[PDB]
């Protein structure tokens, strides 16, 4: 999550295919969930805080 690449992330690029997601929070490139625009770290964190609505902890 170097600063430039978070910005580059947003720049609509020369080709449709250099489209890639980062975390709306940390900017992490790698484990980013479509649906939240968050990584699997941030997901975990915000989920526990209670700030992802209707997101319960599973158990079956």
């Amino acid at each position: 999550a170097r600063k430039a690449l978070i910005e580059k992330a947003k720049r609509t690029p020369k080709f449709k295919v250099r489209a890639y997601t980062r975390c709306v929070r940390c900017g992490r490139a790698r484990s980013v969930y479509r649906f939240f625009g968050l990584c699997r770290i941030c997901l975990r964190e915000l989920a526990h805080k209670g700030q992802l609505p209707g997101v319960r902890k599973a158990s079956w």
Partner: protein, 206 residues
């Protein structure tokens, strides 16, 4: 790598979410980020007023941000001015009809997120860390509470050797699901580095 976030565990059983709305896969992504931009700002702009929770309820193009605050005047402002400024700056960053109301945390001694903070400040202001804690836990039990616990961790004092201080009274049953247990976390930022304060407050068996 030990204990579970006491809230997310109790979540849905004895503790509620800070955002309550529905959204399909299409919309959710952004109403989320919109909440986080709100809670990003009100958190910066209201540290002076001691703020516990930022509730974000939602309709369609409607947002009911309930802000839960120790010193509710500081949020309001003299004349009624400060609140108007927020509501406009909110509805600016949101571009929707922000409905910001204010709610008086009547007792900051039973708000973990606040107890946490009050300690962190104290730690930043260079206060004695051990005392700071026993005296916080103190104040918490004095006000009804059934159990409480504070954990400062990091470079305590100047300290090359980063250790951990902690203290508790009553029952703080982290395994008991039906236990209403408030958790809060504060981060103290210091010349020597950064320390973390967790505060657990056991409030009542349901």
């Amino acid at each position: 790598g030990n204990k579970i976030h006491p809230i997310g565990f109790r979540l849905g059983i004895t503790r509620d979410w800070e955002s309550r709305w529905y959204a399909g896969k299409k919309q959710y992504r952004h109403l989320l980020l919109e909440d986080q931009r709100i809670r990003g700002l009100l958190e910066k702009e209201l540290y002076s007023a001691g703020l516990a929770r930022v509730d974000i309820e939602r309709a369609a193009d409607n947002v009911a941000v309930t802000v839960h605050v120790a010193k509710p005047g500081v949020v309001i402002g003299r004349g009624g001015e400060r609140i108007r400024v927020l509501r406009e700056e909110l509805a600016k960053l949101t571009g929707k009809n922000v409905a910001l109301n204010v709610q008086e945390v009547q007792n900051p001694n039973l708000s973990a997120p606040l107890v946490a903070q009050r300690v962190a400040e104290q730690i930043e202001r260079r206060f004695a860390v051990r005392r700071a804690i026993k005296q916080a836990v103190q104040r918490v039990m004095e006000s009804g509470a059934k159990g409480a616990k504070v954990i400062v961790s990091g470079r305590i004092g100047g300290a090359e050797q980063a250790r951990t201080e902690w203290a508790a009274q009553g029952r703080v049953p982290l395994h008991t699901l039906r236990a209403n247990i408030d958790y809060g976390f504060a981060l103290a930022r210091t010349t020597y580095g950064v320390l973390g304060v967790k505060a657990y407050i056991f409030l009542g068996e349901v």
